[PDB]
């Protein structure tokens, strides 16, 4: 509850940063797989991968301030974001989000 | 009622048309997975792989009780021509052909 005007600006920032980082990494993966595709089973493994990733990406980047404390905590736990990049938020948030990365 | 060698010419025509479509698919999934630029390109590739996995799994039903319908489809899709089924009884070919026209 309660997000400043610039807290909202630094939130969108850290969101789009971790977002772009993960998309690009995905973009490389789908490329680096086009090489080792020999059998049809390799295509099914690519389909399965695109399924799992699409489901995670569509539901993980939920820009909703009421759960955005949990979203950021995940990204931190996955390396797509560090507390250093959320610099600008109130302190209970930074302290809270941190405690949630290791939970 | 399928002969002993009708079964062999069936396996032949089946897996050949299969290879043509699988090989062609492997090229598409390769050529497209490379030219991906934005994220929207990956979701479109995902949708394609979804529809194809569903179509391919249900397209190649090697079941002699419906294999008259499977072959007729492949012919309507270019993965096979009646010329390649010429080992079958002249009466099946007439049926299979008529289903290509539907």
Of A34, A51, A54, the CB nearest to B33: A34
Q: What sign has the CA pseudo-torsion A63, A67, A70, A74?
A: negative
Task: Answer yes or no: are the C-beta atoms of A73 and A100 closer than 8 Å.
Answer: yes
Distance CA A33, CA A53 (A): 15
Of A30, A47, A54, the CB nearest to B36: A30
**Residue B39 burial class via C-beta count within 10 angstroms: exposed 0-12, middle 13-18, buried 19 and up:** middle
A87: β partners: A89
Distance CA B65, CA B1 (A): 9
Tell me how the structure was determined: X-ray
Task: Answer yes or no: are the C-beta atoms of B74 and B80 closer than 8 Å.
Answer: yes
Is there a contact between A37 and B29 if contact means CB atoms under 8 Å apart? yes
- φ/ψ of residue A89, rounded to 5: -80, 165
Task: Answer yes or no: are the C-beta atoms of B45 and B32 closer than 8 Å.
Answer: yes
- φ/ψ of residue A23, rounded to 5: -65, -50
Q: Which domain holds residue B46?
A: 1-102
Task: Answer yes or no: are the C-beta atoms of B25 and A40 closer than 8 Å.
Answer: yes
- The residue of B23, B26, B39, B51 whose CB has the most chain A CBs within 10 angstroms, and thus the best one to mutate to test that interface, is B39
Chain centroid to CA A73: how far?
A: 9
What is chain B's Cα-based Rg? 16
Cα dist. B27→A27, A41, B1, B43, B57 in Å? 19, 14, 38, 18, 19
Which chain A residue lies closest to B24 (C-alpha atoms)? A40
Distance CA A93, CA A48 (A): 36
Structure tokens at B65: 């009780």
Is there a contact between A43 and B34 if contact means CB atoms under 8 Å apart? no
Task: Answer yes or no: are the C-beta atoms of B18 and B60 closer than 8 Å.
Answer: yes
Distance CA A84, CA A97 (A): 12
- A chain contacts of residue B45, beta-carbon cutoff 8 Å: 30, 50
- φ/ψ of residue A36, rounded to 5: -80, 10
How many domains does the structure of chain A reveal?
1
Distance CA B93, CA B71 (A): 10
Can you tell me whether residue A87 is helix, strand or coil? Answer: strand
- A chain contacts of residue B57, beta-carbon cutoff 8 Å: none
Can you tell me whether residue A89 is helix, strand or coil? Answer: strand
Task: Answer yes or no: are the C-beta atoms of B41 and A54 closer than 8 Å.
Answer: no
Task: Answer yes or no: are the C-beta atoms of A32 and B35 closer than 8 Å.
Answer: no
A89: β partners: A87
Structure tokens at B86: 């010429």
Resolution of the structure in the document, Å: 3.0
DSSP class of residue B38 equals S
Distance CA A60, CA A68 (A): 10
Task: Answer yes or no: are the C-beta atoms of A47 and A68 closer than 8 Å.
Answer: no
Distance CA A69, CA A71 (A): 6
- B chain contacts of residue A27, beta-carbon cutoff 8 Å: 36-37, 39, 42
């Amino acid at each position: 509850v309660s997000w400043s005007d610039l807290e909202q600006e630094v939130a969108q920032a850290a969101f789009q940063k971790a977002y772009e980082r993960e998309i690009n990494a995905l973009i490389q993966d789908v490329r680096d797989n086009a090489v080792q595709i020999s059998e049809l089973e390799d295509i099914w493994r690519l389909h399965n991968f695109l399924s799992a990733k699409r489901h995670e990406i569509d539901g993980k980047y939920d820009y909703n301030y009421s759960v955005l404390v949990f979203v950021f905590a995940t990204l931190i736990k996955q390396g797509w974001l560090h507390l250093d990049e959320l610099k600008g938020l109130d302190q209970d948030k930074l302290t809270k989000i941190g405690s949630l990365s290791r939970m």
